[PDB]
């Protein structure tokens, strides 16, 4: 067959030459039969599989014509080649038989290509794997022919200019076709591009390349992320799952039933069916992921072998040059292909995890709607929504880590094999270190978790103290108490800081072990290797290929414990879920919803029970209600009327009889149920909107006054924001919803409980009365009132679960049997915050085991960074940076030394075999490893102490400044916001931020060390890191910008699923009664899909990132390999080893660095907010220059001078120049219009509001010229609303401990708390809960006045809140104030006139100005505004 080209084809010796080109005939035979063979062996299948497809869908577009035209051009070239071959046949006497076989072949093939590119018009995926891969393969195989011909043409050998030139042009067209087939075509109608993108643009996730730009320009919104395709929609996956489940569930139910009946002749449930059902429904994706993972696990072990070949080549100086370029190119190609396989495996695996979580949440919801009440009472609503919110997450985590449990053992076994095959049985020393460091990592992780839990408890205590400080800041300002509470929260914070330091030290040990495992394993392996034998030499190939294999081995061997832990947690999660879904549905045998019947409601001989073991709550019942027949059942409390209602709907288990119901029911429960949303949405309750009926039912049910009181009217949002409607509004809203629903039977069940009498009668008359809106509808009332009965249609009295009698009210008042007796007698008739946070703690402490591999599974202005770094210190971060740079320099030195230890095998100069030399080598290698370890410990421990100092200082400043901010700041800012800055931002600064910054430093220095090694070998590489740096910088910028918003959107969308599930499982009787299950199913599926698209877009963002980063690391490896092949005449094999076994470890560090840059951007906003509250404006100085004469109020003489005060510097004066005077000892009341300036007086004597004009002078000293605390301590107050600080009676009465126990007891006896306080066990140290739960209201203000009396100043400003307190309390207050504060100036602010005439003086204050002065005796003679207001 050699004659086919008149020249030899399989020579194999032309390669054995410096400039070694392939033989032409070999090329034109096999490098042409490979692509054409691929095209022909599969094309009939592609055509046979496409021409049985959907509509022609032959939209004639621009790529389709471009590709057809280029293939036509190229067919024309093939025909021209045939013509020239025949023309040469007319010339020479002999022609190779292939000179026409090759062109003819192309002719046929291109027709086929023209018939495949047209075929694509029928499919949705235009450019598929087949034709795209054929173009790749053809362009790849033709480069050999290209290079041969061009090299021969520069020789000007005159062989054939025409053949060579037509080949050049045909190859150009094949390049343009490959490019034009990579491009995803002109996308059709607005589908997600995941299913219209070409093969290459879908392998590299380059169809996501426009979401990333779009998210970088302006932030993404829920309408900027494309919908997930229809195969993942909740309805689709749940339908598939239920088809695959029903059979397994039934089989397990049969097994459980047979087991129970065998036992009998709750700890058993139909079990071991969920995991089989999930595999039987997702097995195709399981296989796809399995095969992709297998291919990647086999491809991982080619790069060490190519590295071995390249070291060997650079060593042997008599080798060819075409070998080594081939090895560098193969390193690039293998890393590219394994990147594609791995990223596609992640996409499959993570989307399968998402689909498993989706189908499980949807199954949970579908089951909660039909769970038997007997099985529904076992759980709690918090625990059920927990079953949705943690169990499905655990099952998703197991689904992600499911393929690692065998992939990691394949990788471990192959790595042990390939390490053995190089370094003999002394590999087990290194692998033994690697394995033996697993229990140590576990021990450190356990101690970390214990410290974290104790810290969490201590943090919650501090947070509760802070919350009671902030919510009662007014009193704390009054009595000058911020130093005491400052010290208390400082003590708790000091405890938390010590725990944080211990956490830090263990984290440091964990980091040191993580970063020193590789150097220690290599020193142990090489020492044990070179020692155990004399003829056991260590050369560059063994040393550096074994180092590469150790870096491959150490990742699976460390992730294996966490994978097994995740599987074992998901096992118990599966048991919990599988127990929920197996519980039998509620039975509807007893209650039948027929369509036609004689009576609307018919109870036939029925008894019903909550729990069959006990006696029936409702006994035998025989009754019938015809349409329109209003019935008002009445009975003793606990008789079962509420139970009768509950049984009618179906919320009871039948013990006997049955019930017939026709039409649609409407339920008004005793327990009110209001969904999250607006009053209008609740009233409509998912029904058609009609303004006539809507306004009629608002008017009838008397909501209009409530809407007028409420801010938004019928648009106010209930729940999740907080309106907490009083029982009247809730009950009216429920009744309005029922009335608007327009049902057939209305089961009114005590709908006038929390309602006033007259409004209740109005509601009865215009809602359920005979003239009400519900005249024609059967309406069963459940009454605790009587006055409605004289006009109700019919009465059924109930007792002991049985009807005593039924009749009209006339019969009730006439028959005088049980009728009159009943008529006479009836007159006298949180859970998630501590658990949902636990799963976040677990998945953040388990995915924080990055180990430079944070691709395992994942979950701003420079001034802010400068603020944090200024807090942590500047010398500290200088020495942290320096002592990690020393670590990296020692690592570079260690590699350089190993390169000079493997080198003494080549230069076997006699002296490189003595035992002293080997001892020196292994000793200095160990010393370099030890120096690296010491530098790392110093750096990390210093980092921990410095970052602890930063956290301490930041919290100190924030708390010292918040406690000293004028009351306007606390009025204009929600307490929730400040507490949230003290809770989740001090925590971020404490825990997450230091480790994120430290890890960023470690990644940066690892990269810099690798790059300086590469550039130390071949310095030209310092120029190929200016474009690589630009590519990497652009990648991280785009990825972090987009991923931040995707994570935010996912978090925003996740919560509504659980909120809606909790609202469904809470108000289930109402949903079932209105017959609204399908609407709620649809809503839950909609919310799940809206979340699903965000989480899927996040997954794809991660894959986009990973492809780009593996490309950057691949280009580093490939460029260094090329520069070490090119420059081989000046370097050695050892340099190749240590340059190229490190560049292989540059993609993991790049992934880690991008992830940590994103994390630092996310976390530093905590410092942003903390620094925002550090700078909040402060009050006046507490102590400025002056002191009192040991007692500033001598007798309480207060003088005003046209005082003018403003609430906020941009507003109008509330006081407009008051000029009055109070002498020593008089009692002054102040009066006026509502909002005329009452509050400002008691708010301005304490300087809480600074003067805008005028001044107040006490005892000849102006208020504005003394320190704020100095003045504020010397007065006295009884605040408007008594706030009690949780703790001890001693602290509440006296936190400063300045008052002795004897006088505290004397003041408490003056306040007369001996009966209540002395009777307590501890006495004056009795615990005080958060205000209430003890110390009755009267005790509360009596304690407040005790505080006032032990303060015992000469000035008593006070005001009254409400008269709800017992009159004895007010009388005691006034008597005490008059008996022990008689000789003290008193100012009272009262809006109740009846307690003011007793005052020695009254000030009249309207519109912020005085009206009259003098005593009430001096007033009442006149008839001024005081008279116009008093006694009326």
Numbering used by the authors: 1 to 265, 298 to 861, 895 to 924, 958 to 1530
Cite, word for word, the article reporting this structure.
Multidrug resistance-associated protein 2 (MRP2/ABCC2) is a polyspecific efflux transporter of organic anions expressed in hepatocyte canalicular membranes. MRP2 (multidrug resistance-associated protein, 2) is a primary active transporter of the ATP-binding cassette (ABC) class. We have built an atomic model for rMrp2 that consists of a small N-terminal transmembrane domain (TMD0) that is linked to two transmembrane domains (TMD), TMD1 and TMD2, by the lasso linker (L0). Each TMD consists of 6 TM helices, enclosing the pocket for substrates and drugs binding, and they are linked to two nucleotide binding domains (NBDs), NBD1 and NBD2, where ATP binding and hydrolysis provides the free energy required for the transport cycle completion.
